[PDB]
Each structure stands twice: as C-alpha cells, then as structure tokens.
Design a protein around this ligand. Sequence first.
Ligand SMILES: [Zn+2]
Lengths: 32, 39, 548, 287, 40
Amino acid sequence: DLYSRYKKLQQELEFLEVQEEYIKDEQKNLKK
Amino acid sequence: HNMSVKAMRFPPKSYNKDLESAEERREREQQDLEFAKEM
Amino acid sequence: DQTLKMIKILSGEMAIELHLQFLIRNNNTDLMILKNTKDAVRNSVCHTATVIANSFMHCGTTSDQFLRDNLEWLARATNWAKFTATASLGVIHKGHEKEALQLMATYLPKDTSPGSAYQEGGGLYALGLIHANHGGDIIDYLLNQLKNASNDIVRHGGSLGLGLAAMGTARQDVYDLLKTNLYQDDAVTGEAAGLALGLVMLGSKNAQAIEDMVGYAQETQHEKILRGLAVGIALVMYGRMEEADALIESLCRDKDPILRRSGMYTVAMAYCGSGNNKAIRRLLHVAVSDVNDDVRRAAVESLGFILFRTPEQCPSVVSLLSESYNPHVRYGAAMALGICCAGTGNKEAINLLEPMTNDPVNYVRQGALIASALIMIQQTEITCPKVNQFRQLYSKVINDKHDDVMAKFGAILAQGILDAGGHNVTISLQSRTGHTHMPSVVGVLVFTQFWFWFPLSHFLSLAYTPTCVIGLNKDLKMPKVQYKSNCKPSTFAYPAPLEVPPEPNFQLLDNPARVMPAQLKVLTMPETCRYQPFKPLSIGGIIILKDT
Amino acid sequence: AVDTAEQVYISSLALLKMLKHGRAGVPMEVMGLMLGEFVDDYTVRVIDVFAMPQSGTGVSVEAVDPVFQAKMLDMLKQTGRPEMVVGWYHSHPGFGCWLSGVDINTQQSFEALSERAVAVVVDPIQSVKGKVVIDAFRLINANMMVLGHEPRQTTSNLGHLNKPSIQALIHGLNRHYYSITINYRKNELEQKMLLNLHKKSWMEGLTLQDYSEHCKHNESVVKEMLELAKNYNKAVEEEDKMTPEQLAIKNVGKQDPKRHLEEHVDVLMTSNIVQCLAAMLDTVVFK
Amino acid sequence: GLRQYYLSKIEELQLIVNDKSQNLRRLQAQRNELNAKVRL
Ligand SMILES: [Zn+2]
C-alpha cells in the first residue's frame, strides 16, 4: 500500500512534537 | 560563547549507566546493618 | 430457533458454560509451586499473598483442592484475610450459577454465626465476582440483604458485589441504597459507596450524579470517602474525547491532591486507546510539575491506558522516565510498560525492565515484577528467551530470608499471574474488531489500586479471557474435527513441570483447543475432515463449523 | 485492630510551635501537649499545641502538672473553641527520633485514658529546609512479643514506605513501638500570605550602590584577575602531560585558575549590568 | 498525478524529521548529564 506511507508518517510528527517540548520543561525544572 | 556551547554538547555520548551503588554490596550493607541492630 | 435467537445471542450463556467447559477439561497446574511457597509461614502478608495467588491461577475452574488441603494454615490469618479468603472462593467459581449458593451455604451470615463477621460478610463480595455482567436474582438477592444488615463490614462486600453485577446498567434501584450508603458521613463506607456508584453509571455522564459526587467530596473529613469517589468520577465518563475537558481542567486546577489525581484517571478513561496529541500535552505536563507523589504516579500510569492501540511507541517515551530522581515516577514507569505491551511478548519492554529490579527502593522492585509477569503470560521460551530466565528469578527472591516483605510480595503475586488457569486464560484489552474490551479496561485500572486496599485488586478476573478456538455445528452438538499446524512445532510448548520427590508440526487438536493468538496464522484449515468451516478462520472463540 | 495506614494529619501552626519551643530551651529535653481534634479509627488530626513549662534543671521528661493543664484546658475553652488532648510530645536535642526507656513510661501513663494518644518526637537541629525531623510513634503491647505475633495486620501498601533509621532500629523499634507516616495540611488561607511576605525587596534595586566605590570595586577584582589569568597562562601549558585524571588528585593543595577564573566573570557582570541598567531607568522616571 | 502529488509529501516530511529528531537527542542527553548530577 502507498496511502499509509504518508498518514502514518504524519502520525509521528504529532508524536515527535511533544518530546522536544517535554525536555524543554526539564531543562529548568531539575535546576529548581 | 553561545556557539562554543552549541558546538560542544555533541561528544556527550556513551554515558552508559549511572550505577547507584550495587546489588550485592547493597545487600551486604543491609546485612551489616541488621547485625548492628541485633547487637 | 429465531424465537430462541435473542436468548442464544444476547444472554450469551452458551459462551459462559462453554468457557467453563473449556476450563473444566483443560487444567494444567501444579501443587508443588504452592508447596514451594508454603515454607514462608509467618504472621506477615504471606497468608494473603498465597490465597491471592491460587485464586489468580484457578479462575473459573472450580478446583478446591489447593485450599482444602488444610484448614488451620488457611484460617491462621485474621480480620481481613478471612474477608479475602471468602472472596477468593468466588473467583475459582467464576461464571457458574449453581455452585455459588450451595458451596457458600456454610458461609451464609445467618447459619454459623462465628466470632468473625468478615468471614461471612465478605461472601457477597464473591457473589458479585461470579455473576459479573450477569444481572438476575444476584441483583435482588444482594439488594434485599443490603436493606437490613450490619455496619460496613458486610456492606463492603455487598456494595462492591452489587455494583459489579450491575456494572454499566444505570439501574435506579442500585442507585437508591447507594445514596444512603454514601451519606453515612463515615470513612469505612467510603470504598463501599464511591466505587460501585461509578460502576453502575459507567459511560453515563449523568451530570447531576457527577455534581452529587464531586459536590460531596469537598467537605468530607475522611480519606477513603475521598478515595472511592476518586475512581468513581473517573469511571462515570468513558471514551468521550472532548466531553470531559471542562471537568478535567476543573479537577487539575483544584487544591486537593486526591482530586487532581482523580482527574488524571478521568482523562485516562476519556481517551481509551486514543492517540490524541491534545490529551498528552497536559496529562504529561502535570507529570513534570506537580508536587504530590500520588498524582505523579497516576500521571505516568495513564500512558498505556491511552496508547495501548500502538504498543511500539510507549517504550520510546517511558524508558526515559525509568531513570527519574524520585522512585515514584520510577515506579509508574514500570507499570506503564506493564499495561501497554502486556498482550505482546515485547522484546524492547523486557530489555527496559531488566535493570528495573535492581533499584534500592523496595516498591519499584515490586512493580517491576508485576510488569514482568504481565508481559509474558502464555509464552514458552520462543516468543522471547527471557521467560525461563525469570521463572528462576521469582524463586530466587522468594526463597531468600533477607529480602523485604514488599519486594517478595511481587514474586508471590507473579506466580498466580504467569500460570493463570493452567495457561488457558489471558489478558485482552483488545478485540480483533479494533474495539476495546471494556470490562478488562475497568479490571486493569481497578487492579492498580492495590496500594490503598489489598482485595481491591482482587478485581482482576474481568481481564482474564481465554484463547481457544471452538467449533460448533448445531445449537448444542460438539463436532469432531482435527486440524494441524504449519510453522515451527516447539512454539506449542507446555510449562512441563519437573516433579522431583523426528518432530511434529502436524499437531492434531480437538474442538476446545487452546492456541496462542500469534499461532492463529500457523495452523492448517481442515480440508480432509467431514467438517468445513463456513467462516474464514481468523479469530478464535466459537464459530459455526459446516458439516460437508 | 489497626491497618498500618494511620496517616496523622497535623497542621500548619503547630510545627512552628514545636520547633520554637524545641530550640529556645534546646539541650534540656523539653515537652508539651497536643490539643487536636480526634477523628475516626484510621486517622487523627492535631491542630493546636500548647507548651508546658519545665520542673527543674536536668534532662528529663519529668511529669505533667495537672494543675497547669486543667487551668489551660479551660483557658482557651472560654475564649475560642473546644478541643481535646490527642497526644503529647518531647524533643530529642541532637539525637534523631526514638522512644527511650524514660520516654516510654510517661507514654504508657497517657495511653491508659485514650488508646490513641500519639507520642511525637521533633528534632530542631537536624532540620534545614526540606527536613523537619519528625516521625511520631506509638507503643505496641509487649504481651504480643511473648506470643511471637506480628501486630498491625497490613491491609494497604501505605505503611512500609518510609525506611526507619538504623539508630532508631537500635532502640525499641521495632519491638515496642511503630512509625506512622504523616503529611501536612496546607491551605491557600495560609500559603499565599507567607510566600508574598517573607523576602520582598523594597526599593533596593532603585539605587546606585555607592557610586564612587562601584567603579572602585570594578578594579578591586580586575587587578588580581590579571594574575589569576597568569595562572591560566600557566596551567594550560603543562598539559599534554600526565593523564589529567592525575591532574585531579594532584591539584588539591594549591588553587586552580580555571574554576576561579570563571568565578569573577559572573561577579564582574551582575555587579555591572544591574548597576548600569538601574542608572538608566532613573533618568526617564525622575524627570 | 499521484506520482507528482502524493509522493511529493514523503520527500518533504522526512526533511522535518531528520533535524527535529537530532534536536531531541542533543537535548535529552543534555538532561541526562544533569540527571546524573542530581541523584549522585
Ligand atoms: Zn526523649
């Protein structure tokens, strides 16, 4: 199949975006 | 000074495992503590 | 007939006794393992820890020989184990109408009248366990006894039994006596009312009843009444995707740490299997910032409840949380893997849980063992080689004297998990249809609260589901079909106990034949028998098997 | 029976009363009463604490003077609201927390009236910020010790969370008493009105900080910062040498540049940037 | 034009992955050295 090649690949940009925002919280939270 | 930070944090890698203290020597620490409490 | 059809398909009775028929025929267990764990006789947790193990590994098989070998070691522990010993009797008789009243005829509260009322008041807890999702007299027999009874020592087992049988039914009659059970201004009715008050209103969002519950848990001065309602207001909303978000912000903002924690379970149940980016932002933001440890453990344990639909992504995010500074997040990282990938023999998850049993905190060594138990049930050495690597590991830590009681509490509990029903039942939060199995979703969430009540995680039989293909040709008649397999034959292995004082891939099978779900593809269709299945054989369970 | 989840809710006012009375009369073991509001079989709540005066010189828990407490119990009764004595405390000065053999006897006189009087130990010396040294206890019957029977019949995974110290384990724990997990009752009626009132700088940053001496202090650092850079013009030059793990042990006698040299740069920046900015806001606001 | 419409999205999305994933691995290991300082 080819239709899943983009729909599943945009599905993880949804999933990737939290993680860089997530460690952004912990660069300051561990210092406090 | 920012670029000497932004081009510096790449060789942090293979920090393999921060070991707490032990499994065995921790248990030996617990046994030694139990000996003192009995004493 | 077509007149009889609504009985045959909506009561679902011929799946109940047939699953009982599968368990009464297939029973591959051991007495020696309980005799290996017999040697820990002391006044510790162990008596409750043994009776919770055999009740897990003998669900619905009605086999009372692992308990009837003695009476004194069973009746040694008291005052809540006798609440749990009479509780465990019903799980062994799960899904069986007849041998509920007649075996507990000793344990009716008005026959013997001993010095223990927990022995006789906890029977109604087990009656709800037998007829879960089956409402009949078991509603009204448990209704009428809760009009006139003792204090909240029979009223725990009665109310938790009655909300279990009427789970998700929105009955007004069960709501009536659960109102007056709630407004006792009493701590000991707190788990009695608030848990079953959500169970009968599952997925109902009757907003007056929500306003009754959250309006009651703001002024009360006890904590179990704050805690039983904490799960119940999470359970009243179930799979809504947007319809709780006003309430989720209302609970997250509140000063109450219990109620913020309750809002974390509510967003876990409003997004069951949902890969929503919107939920995961502030569910896992408050996993960072909040100061109570209870809410931080409930935060990371909401991840597998919302992301079990794809088990590939959860080891990529919770591996990083297994090295947190506090052990509380280090705990809830382990059960997050234990509730997500548990239906799979996940190679990556066991790789993460390998050093998790090494941590100097006792309860993270505990929850590492439960998550190691859930990851590899009904798996023998070829889905992953780490099975027998861990079979020795639970025996390694239970025969030690110098371990903690809590650390070896995970080992004794993992024995009843990993050998459940003689390797005949398994967990499934998932059907082949894509639809989630909602009593198992309730049953695994309620299982997490063994911290705050020990027989509250006795609610685990809802998660146990068989894996057996079943053939059928008439309404009643068993067929006689025997098919075989195609792939590698050692995958069909058995536990093969030791009992100390040239190969197949043509494995013939009868009609109630157990099979791994990964072994559904490796079998052969019956082409040479008299029977030929009209259905394409893709799922197990019961099918019509057309006689040709 | 008890379910080892006993969960003592205390207060916010009493802990300050505990530490002040424990610190001002420190090396003598001081004591007092716990005037709280008793609740159910599971928890107990102690909201108010009044201190009891001593008897004489000497570290002891001597005895209670029921002349004093009976007049004190009806003192605030006629003014505020009724409460009831739910326990008592003393203070080990620099020990830790345990029940001594003298401490256990005055406890045993108090468990006779009510079976739930709490023995509380506070230590006002081993406490710094996130430590308030605590863990109240309560006796167990020695009758059950002869039976060999383990009490308190664990029904919840809430008791065995804190690990006891080995020095308290030398004493009667766990053969005569037990620990109890506690938390604290905080509320916004108190939380905000102590945060926004403790360290508030009034008009300090709207000053110039001794304007002839700030630039004078701006040379009082830089002059020795030259020679501290000469050490940094020295220590880098003996590298590609004996394997700088050896340059970790060996540098514990004499001072290093590299850490000391990035030290003053933080000092010579925040002393300058704060003072230069505050000079340029006075020019706009003041005419 | 499914060659020249749909396949034009696979070629684009991989470019956003190949640096934002590198942003994470730099950043999480930056915390991982910081987390080693805390527990020790
Ligand atoms: Zn003392």
